[PDB]
């Protein structure tokens, strides 16, 4: 019945590096999806297997936000079933999951003059990743985020909301 901690996940000072993407468990909260949807900052709110406006009426059993910084061009990979270096070796979404991916350009914040290198992605791995796991030449490459990089190179803060629609006990509900 109390409001839901969406702000902390979305407005976190520093996101996690994709190679070790973060995951928060959201529960016992009345999630208000309208505020997120109507916000214009998000370039892409693509919902798979659910209708974005319908979201505010459903109830969910477990919902997780996965948050991490990547380059602008790789965001297309976050779509399920797309094969690439970032998908295969860093973060790969189960085939036909039911979730919504939200992204926004964060070049206002994450980019630093002279480059910010705190963000890493895995350069080498022996085999492709299984759904929703994380792994921890030298195999980690730093991103060179400079404030005047190209749009593809600019960092995009991506939050993936993954939620199961089956009618088990539901602790996260909308109005």
């Amino acid at each position, epitope marked *: 019945t109390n409001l839901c*901690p969406f*702000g*902390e996940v979305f*407005n*976190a*000072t*520093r996101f996690a590096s994709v190679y070790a993407w973060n995951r928060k468990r959201i529960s016992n909260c009345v999630a208000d999806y309208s505020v997120l949807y109507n916000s214009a900052s998000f370039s892409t709110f693509k919902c798979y297997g659910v209708s974005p406006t319908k979201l505010n009426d459903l109830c969910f059993t477990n919902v997780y936000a996965d948050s991490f910084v990547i380059r602008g061009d790789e965001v297309r990979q976050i779509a399920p079933g797309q094969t690439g270096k970032i998908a295969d070796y860093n973060y790969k979404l189960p085939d036909d999951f039911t979730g919504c991916v939200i992204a926004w350009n964060s*070049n*206002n*914040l994450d*980019s*630093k*003059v*002279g480059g*910010n290198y*705190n963000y890493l992605y895995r350069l080498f791995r022996k085999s492709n990743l299984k759904p929703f796991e994380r792994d921890i030449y030298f195999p980690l490459q730093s991103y060179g985020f400079q*404030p005047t990089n190209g749009v593809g190179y600019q960092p995009y803060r991506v939050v993936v909301l993954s939620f199961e629609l089956l009618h088990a006990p539901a602790t996260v509900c909308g109005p």
Partner: antibody, heavy 120, light 106 residues
Framework: EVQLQQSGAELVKPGASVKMSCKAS????????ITWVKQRPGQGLEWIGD????????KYNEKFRSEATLTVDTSSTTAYMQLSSLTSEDSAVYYC?????????????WGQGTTLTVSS | DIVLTQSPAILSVSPGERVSFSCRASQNIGTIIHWYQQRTNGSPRLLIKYASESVSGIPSRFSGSGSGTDFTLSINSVESEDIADYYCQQSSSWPLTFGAGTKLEL
């Protein structure tokens, strides 16, 4: 050496806005954010808002989204906080601070303490 | 918004006693907490970085501990040189929130 120094002390009648400044020195200005904090006689510190010198982004405490507006002259490396109007409750002591967003995320360098006498 | 409750507002103490403080956040912060001290008339200054380990420059007598949600600070002994208020602060997510502050006194 890195140190921040407050513009000084100002006295004004109510309604008379104050635009005040903390003088930055001794470090690469773009590298470390600037953050403004506020306090009043008899209670502890409260955050006002943040600004990024290298891109001019700003953040605010919701209670002061309207009264305060933050700007920077990244050439001379000095940041400014503008207050639109003043009440006799607003009589307060203000500190300008350094925020190390990309490293420690600490307010490890501060000003000498600006005083605002709002007085009718 | 995380609200950072810190008390007792006055921690009356006799010098030589070990003292302890504690910060309780209103949500999981992780470990991004700091403490600041304010001597009489003075500005605040950073003491503990990431709530457990002393910043490079402060005496080793100041030690932090705790993680996740319950953060605490203890000073091995308080002399009148350390008479000051201490404020909790968090920097994990916006908006940033300072504590109420606690007072040492005889």
């Amino acid at each position: 050496e890195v140190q921040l120094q407050q513009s000084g002390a100002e006295l004004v009648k109510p309604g008379a806005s104050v635009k005040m400044s903390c003088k930055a020195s001794g470090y690469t200005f773009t590298s470390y954010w600037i953050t403004w904090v506020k306090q009043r006689p008899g209670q502890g510190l409260e955050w006002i808002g943040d600004i990024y010198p290298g891109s001019g982004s700003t953040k605010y405490n919701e209670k002061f989204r309207s009264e305060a507006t933050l700007t920077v002259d990244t050439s001379s490396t000095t940041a400014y906080m503008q207050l639109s109007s003043l009440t006799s409750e607003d009589s307060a002591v203000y500190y300008c601070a350094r925020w190390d967003f990309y490293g420690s995320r600490t307010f490890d360098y501060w000003g000498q303490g600006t005083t605002l006498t709002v007085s009718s | 918004d995380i609200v950072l409750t810190q008390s007792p507002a006055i921690l009356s103490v006799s010098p030589g006693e070990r003292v302890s403080f504690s910060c309780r956040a209103s949500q999981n912060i992780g470990t991004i907490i700091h403490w600041y001290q304010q001597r009489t008339n003075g500005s605040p200054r950073l003491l503990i970085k990431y709530a457990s380990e002393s910043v490079s420059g402060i005496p080793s007598r100041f030690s932090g501990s705790g993680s996740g949600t319950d953060f605490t600070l203890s000073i091995n002994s308080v002399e009148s040189e350390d008479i000051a208020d201490y404020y909790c602060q968090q920097s994990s997510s916006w908006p940033l929130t300072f504590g109420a502050g606690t007072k040492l006194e005889l």
